[PDB]
Ligand binder design. Structure first.
Ligand SMILES: [Mg+2]
Length: 144
């Protein structure tokens, strides 16, 4: 049960989240991947997200901003990212792994969770701290 690191990526106005669908499942989830030995959490996340969506998180990632969950034996650590351009040309840099990359209206997801024909993984067990984090992001706007 090697740990997995990935990112929850929100757009400029914090209304949409970027999710990926693999080629062997119809579930939507965060871009992510297994720790490749002799590497820390941040480098793993940067490498894996770049492989899966072609975007380099180096200047965006904050080692203090993450959600951690143990799920079916595996440790997942999902870093929280805001301000990413919606019109960036996302595309995978590895073969046969990622089928689709799409922005989702985060409010709609929360409203239609276990009610749509759409399957999710990880994000459904993280809805609360995610929306708490977004709330917090608005509360601090005047601090900048
Ligand atoms: Mg990978």
């Amino acid at each position: 049960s090697i740990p997995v690191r990935g990112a929850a990526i929100f757009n400029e106005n914090l209304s949409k989240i970027l999710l990926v669908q693999g080629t062997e499942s119809d579930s939507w989830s965060f871009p992510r991947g297994k720790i490749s030995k002799d590497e820390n959490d941040i480098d793993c996340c940067i490498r894996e997200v770049k492989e899966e969506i072609g975007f380099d998180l180096t200047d965006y990632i904050d080692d203090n901003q993450f959600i951690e969950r143990n799920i079916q034996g595996k440790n997942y650590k999902i870093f929280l990212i805001s301000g990413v351009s919606e019109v960036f040309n996302f595309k995978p840099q590895v073969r046969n792994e990622i089928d689709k990359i799409e922005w989702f209206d985060f409010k709609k997801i929360s409203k239609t969770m276990y009610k749509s024909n759409i399957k999710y993984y990880l994000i459904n067990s993280m809805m609360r701290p995610l929306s708490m984090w977004l709330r917090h992001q608005r509360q601090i706007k005047n601090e900048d």
